[PDB]
Design a protein around this ligand. Structure first.
Ligand SMILES: [Zn+2]
Ligand SMILES: [Zn+2]
Ligand SMILES: [Zn+2]
Ligand SMILES: [Zn+2]
Ligand SMILES: [Zn+2]
Ligand SMILES: [Zn+2]
Lengths: 469, 475, 474
């Protein structure tokens, strides 16, 4: 129990270090699924899907979808079980025209992606992570890169020169080199020359060959364990790469439980794990939670899996989908606010979250969180079922912000509206959310992984124990 | 020069990494001097000094002073050449009563030492550095420790639980987290003024029981090691550059001069032998220098007085001269070269620079001028040091680049020890440094070439000052 | 009985405070207390031919007190200079040189606000006088220290009725102007030279000095509350009075010092090896910048002059230098700065640092500050805490202590500790006792704390050198 907790956190830290951007999160989660026997399914190909098989798809190399069609997945008693995460995080991203030269220093123009605590980005060893596009002969090559060396620095202004409000335009401009070193190394103009020198060396191409790029600035300080008892994990992108890790680990674990049982109710469901892009910016895109992509994927799965059923029983995709929705559920997973010891005015006295105290069941009146009491009562029952078999408890705690105070929104409600499925919003407690370096607790990583697993395994079973009004 | 500058920068980084606090910078500087054949000297022994000998002293293990008495140091033509730096930086230090328990989290009570940019300390992998006192039998053991693992964290409040503009309460919000009550209990199943998770960490590091730790002076320290940055590896980034980068340069400049004297003696088996060379690293600069180990202390004057008393014991008693008469004579040819970091021209804040006195990376030694004497620099004295750089160039064929600095007239700036030491010692002097950005932050940035220029400038000062003085024509 | 002794120290402290209504009278009373314990009065203007195993007392300008005892075996090799400090000035309303004010048929006195006092507390109090008077007697310029314990002056508040009724903003120049008489009574009395002085004031001063009004040349007089300090509380556990800051601390420095001297003069140890110093500086309340303040060269000169006398043979026969002997002794020397501390105020909890709260009867406040407003460093406080432990081992009486610090956001007052540490190149700590209402005409402290402080001073003097020999360096 304690051995497996640290193991998950160690694996979680390795995954976060390798996934410095949304693009690298897709690649890493895709490779993780490929290694568990998942088939690389594309959008621009005919879907000829088989039952008792897993499939993997990265839409635009920035949206991760993993799904497993159950051995005996049926229209009448089956469920579409979706657990969601988001593979994007707040970042400083390089602007299209980034060449800035002020006070003899070469700088990079950067965009402010998401509502980040930008002051934390100041005075940090910065690397790069993203997608680049370069000409190679007659082709347009897309390559995913990550520079783990410190090449950029966003310097603070000395206290001595002041009598703090950051201007996001003028003050957030990181330095890359000096005009002197740029001149010594020398001996389209919209791109910074020291940046193109770095990118050319990385891609093994000419500076001239670099066309366009989508790159995040990334702290080179690897995530690690903190505290005298090494009970804490600290690092960038915990929101929501720590959450997405737990979604995919719990999903992989269920797929392996099905594979393991093959080597009984667990065979009649469609199991989906999805890591969206564009969450930090409001989800409105083809790869974000508001996209038709998810609904289309489900329709395409239904069409392939029930090809004979729709033609023989005269059913439509819409008819099948409506039936499945009655037994379907969405478990949205995103980071939660741990009760801050230095800011007690921010916590609602009765809905306080503590480190190692388990999964945060997130409630919001204005439905910023999809959670409803009945749906949460069902998920708590799957954890009770997990406890009866595994003799291991899944810890939980209810969250809510103060009535007079506003809070952030999750994809839960967007996806629930789009798919017309019930759902709840969960996650694990963390501090400093939207900082370049956040902090979470080791046992909560364990609780979330087993929490997502217990949901996939027991939702359909709990559903049969229900008596309506 | 280009390869040498990178070698200097590498050594500077290693010294800054090994020195997470004033205590450790002073120990590392002492060891460096001993390794160069410097004799250990205690304040509590009779000083029976010799010419052509180097000595090292550590007042209270937080003040560092190195001195070399020239083979021909004399009352009539000699000079006292002093180069200063400071070994303290802005830091979050552990409070006497540090035990804090709020929202099921064990916290440590901390103090804000100096005028640091405290927001930069939030969300960092923090360790410890400094002095610890514990009982081992019937003895009070003083041990200097440095824990380079992440043990402490100052968490920011999330943006979601906030109504851009950053406003920190230094008492309430600067309280790092050490553990949960759960794990503290678990480890307890596997005086009260001190945090138990903290005593556990210290006792393990010292190899004593928890009840043994009496008192400690511990600096929280960024565990992220200083490194090189920029596409061309032309910048250095790390904590304590102010003033462990300047202090490193003072000591390397002083060691280089001593080695040149030792090599000159080995070669000639000339004017370099007639002076007393001193290099001092004070503590408490960040807090106004008022202490027994700070620039306002009587210690410096007392050390000079003791060297004079010893070295000129024959002349005092035979020629019937006093320490004061000898001191007064020497001071006429003496000089203080104060070294502290300067402000590079910030590319994102053009409103902060005085248009004609702008500093740039790799553009040399910053000659710091202030009208209110926040910097001791005077035109004549700057002129003299600028001539030592010319004499260096003539001989070693390497230019020591310089650049004049000043803040805008309507704007205030921080002071240096320069003027304090000049008043105390009755000596002339200047304020020099190297340009850096993000001063008083937990991670500052500087340039590689400047490190090279500073070391070469300190060596040039020590070598040519007395020579330069002999070419002066009075009014 | 420790409790009986605590009450006795407290009773003695109050009598001393009552008689010391100014820096001048604190100095005379502390000097007289030292002379009664067999200390030799020393003048700065005479050749110091000191003897070892003797106590000396000097009063620079009759406003700075210094007591010192030279140990029989005070030596260069193993000797320590142990200094305990207090300050003998307090916040006060002091008579201005041109004090003659006449408004609304009332004779008033022009006063200076000395130190950062809680001036509203000075209103509606029975005021007397304490200080120095200069007068001509034939061919002589006579200095005379006086104290008038009768209520002669009054600083009246303005009636609440004549105001908007509630907050109070005092104009230090306009509203701080005490009344001495009416023009009617001044006219009747003279009917029964220099116009810069209030005539009713010259009349008061001349009756006291037994001279003529025209003979009064100059004076440096503090206005002083005539209400004597006393015990308070249902159980008489508190002491209340003026000038606790820092005549209470200064009393405890000198009593600790007298107890040490008496322990040597018997009226492991290694007690005869040291030079023991007790000093009461003037001017702490205004920054300490004077020849009689803690920024003065006098302390360094006093030590140098002691070194010159006690080590005359080592200097003139063995060819040692004052500076060499000084440098050597500094390594084993220490400063115990004593000044009042802030007790946790029960009505203003927002002013306390939660983990560093001071409480009445709970011991000696060991005061910490990062900006070095207090000279205290964690290693040096540890050495002092150990002297208290050794005291307990011998006398089986505990010296309670409690750590103090202000909130990180909030600023605090400075002490003479860091000034003397830089001046003398010596280590040291800042201690004191908890009180409430610092800078008020009437402050309050606790009886048990008076006991602990006196013992803490004694224990430092007695055990520092012993504690120092038990130290293992890095
Ligand atoms: Zn999120
Ligand atoms: Zn977010
Ligand atoms: Zn500084
Ligand atoms: Zn500095
Ligand atoms: Zn005071
Ligand atoms: Zn005081």
């Amino acid at each position: 129990v304690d051995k497996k907790a640290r193991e998950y956190a160690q694996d979680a830290l390795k995954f976060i270090q390798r996934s410095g951007s949304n693009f690298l999160a897709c690649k890493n989660l895709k490779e993780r699924l490929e290694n568990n026997g998942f088939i690389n399914l594309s959008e621009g190909e005919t879907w000829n899907l088989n039952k008792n098989e897993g499939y993997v798809l990265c839409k635009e190399n920035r949206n991760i979808c993993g799904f497993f069609v159950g051995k005996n997945f049926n229209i009448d008693t089956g469920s579409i079980l979706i657990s969601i995460g988001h593979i994007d995080s707040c970042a400083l991203k390089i602007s299209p025209n980034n060449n800035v030269i002020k006070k003899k220093i070469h700088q990079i123009n950067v965009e402010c992606y998401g509502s980040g605590l930008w002051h934390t980005w100041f005075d940090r060893s910065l690397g790069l992570s993203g997608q680049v596009l370069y000409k190679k002969g007659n082709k347009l090559v897309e390559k995913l890169i990550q520079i783990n060396k410190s090449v950029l620095f966003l310097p603070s202004l000395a206290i001595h020169l002041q009598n703090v409000k950051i201007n996001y335009e003028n003050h957030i401009k990181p330095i890359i080199s000096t005009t002197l070193f740029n001149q010594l190394n020398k001996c389209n103009t919209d791109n910074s020359y020291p940046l193109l020198y770095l990118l050319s060396k990385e891609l093994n191409c000419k500076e001239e060959d670099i066309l366009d790029f989508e790159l995040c600035l990334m702290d080179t300080q690897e995530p690690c364990f903190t505290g005298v008892y090494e009970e804490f994990i600290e690092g960038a992108r915990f929101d929501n790469l720590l959450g997405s890790f737990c979604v995919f680990e719990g999903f992989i674990e269920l797929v392996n439980s099905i594979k393991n049982h093959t080597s009984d109710n667990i065979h009649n469901n469609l199991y989906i794990s999805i890591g969206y892009d564009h969450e930090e910016i409001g989800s409105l895109s083809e790869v974000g939670a508001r996209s038709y992509c998810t609904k289309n994927f489900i329709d395409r799965i239904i069409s392939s899996v029930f090809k004979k059923e729709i033609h023989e029983k005269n059913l439509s995709v819409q008819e099948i989908y409506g039936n499945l929705v009655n037994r379907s559920f969405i478990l949205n997973v995103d980071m939660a606010h741990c009760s801050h010891p230095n800011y007690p005015e921010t916590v609602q006295d009765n809905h306080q979250l503590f480190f190692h105290e388990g999964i945060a069941i997130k409630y919001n009146t204005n439905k910023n969180y999809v959670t409803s009491p009945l749906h949460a009562s069902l998920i708590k029952r799957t954890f009770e079922l997990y406890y009866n078999k595994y003799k291991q408890q899944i810890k939980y705690q209810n969250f809510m912000v103060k009535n007079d105070t506003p809070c952030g929104s999750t994809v839960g409600s967007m996806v629930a509206a789009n798919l017309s499925m019930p759902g709840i919003d969960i996650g694990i407690p963390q501090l400093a959310m939207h900082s370049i370096r956040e902090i979470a607790a080791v046992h909560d990583v364990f609780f979330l992984i087993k929490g997502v697993f217990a949901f996939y395994t027991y939702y359909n079973q709990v559903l049969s124990t229900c008596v309506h009004d």
